């Protein structure tokens, strides 16, 4: 039944089907003849000659007068640094014209922006105007802004990623997701700075900027003045941006209804900037004039996920976000406040009062949340965990609890928390990797009596930033 064969073949992946071409001359033709059975390629890594034979295989089989076929994923990366250039040259020189790469993941770390741009320009296999998604693990160049010219070159591009592994020396309605990731050690500026402040990206749903270094010479950058450019911005992730501050960010959030809707916010400054309190001061120019409308509510009213790991937010600032109901609660589902040194819980006798978190007020406000992360929150000693124990009645939605890499928390608090939680049916998942004080017999009791469906106790796991899953800070 020669017509239905693609439905059979597509249950099996490209390289494997290509090996299946060798079973017999008949099935070789039966496979080869159906070009749309191919929809992904992984050439990751590949040597030069095998990439030549891949290009050759396209030039033999996919070569067609009909302007039909398109490919949904083309991952390419060189086995060898010099051959990186040869592979990329051949790709943009000899790609068949009638065939459109939908999504190109050109992981070519040695190559520079300038060289990539040139290879598109003088390679002339024009699909790169017409592809849909792009990714470039490449060397940055500070000297020239060719990466902006990639977007100008690639008008159909909806999702772009750049991973500037190294350094060497107007309206963009199409775009939907911009992911900018940098090696903070090698990258010492901000690549898209001019583009982001000058242009608009009005349909931009998600933005993710990590590892960049904000310039000191530009308070418009440091005050997130550019960030006003992007309404409809469903999610913002921003992490290890060394010269940014959450203070300047909250000053933006004070004084504009910048976003009609954020579903998720994630901010993570790296170094400890001074204490930020929620700047609830509503000044009046005169009492004969209006107090300035503070846009914290309507900006943050939409959030499902709030993530502030490492950000030096004070505990009172977060309580004020809840008492003011700027954070909505009825819509919030996941809260990450790990690694925030300016959080203290009510049972602590040692404090400054505005670093206190009133967990009872907070958990009353936003009760329906699923997922809490308090990892690296050293302030969560065993005594402080008592506040969570008595506030168990307010967190009935909570499924996933990360408190890992806490060097204080004894298994006592863990156990009695899960036991009072059991008065709610296990907690779905709990993470205590690296917690040197949880006794192995206690966590084995947790497993044995089945107080948690899954609990992780990899004591030897030194770090928490799983790339892609937990963080987009590079390596």
């Amino acid at each position: 039944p020669i017509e239905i064969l693609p439905i059979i073949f597509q249950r099996f992946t490209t390289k494997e089907l290509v090996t299946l071409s060798l079973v017999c001359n008949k099935w070789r033709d039966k496979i080869l003849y159906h070009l749309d059975c191919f929809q992904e390629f992984n050439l990751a890594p590949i040597n030069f000659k095998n990439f030549v034979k891949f290009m050759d295989f396209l030039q033999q089989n996919f070569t067609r007068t009909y302007r039909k076929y398109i490919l949904s994923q083309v991952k390419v990366s060189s086995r060898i640094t010099s051959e990186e250039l040869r592979i990329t040259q051949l790709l943009f020189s000899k790609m068949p014209k009638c065939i459109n790469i939908e999504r190109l993941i050109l992981s070519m770390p040695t190559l520079t922006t300038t060289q990539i741009f040139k290879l598109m320009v003088r390679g002339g296999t024009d699909f790169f105007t017409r592809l849909l998604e792009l990714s470039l693990m490449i060397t940055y160049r500070p000297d020239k802004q060719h990466e902006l010219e990639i977007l100008q070159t690639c008008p159909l591009l909806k999702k772009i990623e750049l991973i500037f592994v190294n350094s060497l020396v107007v309206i963009y309605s199409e775009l939907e997701k911009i992911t900018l990731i940098c090696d903070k050690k090698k990258i010492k500026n901000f690549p898209l700075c001019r583009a982001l402040l000058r242009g608009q990206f009005p349909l931009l749903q998600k933005l993710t900027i990590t590892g960049v270094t904000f310039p000191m010479n530009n308070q418009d950058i440091m005050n997130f003045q550019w960030l006003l450019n992007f309404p409809d911005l469903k999610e913002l992730w921003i992490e290890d941006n060394d010269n940014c501050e959450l203070s300047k960010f909250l000053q933006l959030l004070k004084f504009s209804n910048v976003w009609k809707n954020l579903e998720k916010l994630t901010f993570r400054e790296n170094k400890l900037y001074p204490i930020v309190n929620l700047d609830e001061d509503q000044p009046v120019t005169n009492d004969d004039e209006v107090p300035s409308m503070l846009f914290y509510k309507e900006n943050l009213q939409n959030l499902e996920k709030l993530d502030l790991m490492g950000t030096s937010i004070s505990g009172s600032a977060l309580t004020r976000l809840c008492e003011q109901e700027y954070l909505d609660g009825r819509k919030l589902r996941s809260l990450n406040i790990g690694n925030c040194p300016n959080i203290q819980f009510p049972n602590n006798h040692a404090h400054t009062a505005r670093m206190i978190l009133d967990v009872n007020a907070v958990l009353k406000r936003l009760s329906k949340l699923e997922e809490i992360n308090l990892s690296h929150l050293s302030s969560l000693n065993d005594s402080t965990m008592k506040s969570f124990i008595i506030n168990v009645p307010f967190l009935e939605n909570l499924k996933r609890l990360d408190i890992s890499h806490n060097f204080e928390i004894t298994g006592i608090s863990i156990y009695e928390f899960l036991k009072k939680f059991q008065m709610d049916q296990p907690l779905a998942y709990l993470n205590i990797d690296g917690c040197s004080q949880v006794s192995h017999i206690t966590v084995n009791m947790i497993r044995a009596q089945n107080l948690v469906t899954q609990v992780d106790c990899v004591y030897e796991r030194d770090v928490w930033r799983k790339f892609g899953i937990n963080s987009y800070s590079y390596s």
Binding site: S77, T81, S107, M137, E161, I163, F467, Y474, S475
Partner: peptide, 21 residues
């Protein structure tokens, strides 16, 4: 996506460098 894997950089005398000022 790929977190970093190392490689050894190297330098030698070359015609461009030999043709520099």
């Amino acid at each position: 996506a790929i977190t970093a894997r190392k490689r050894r950089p190297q330098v030698k005398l070359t015609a461009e460098k030999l043709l520099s000022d």
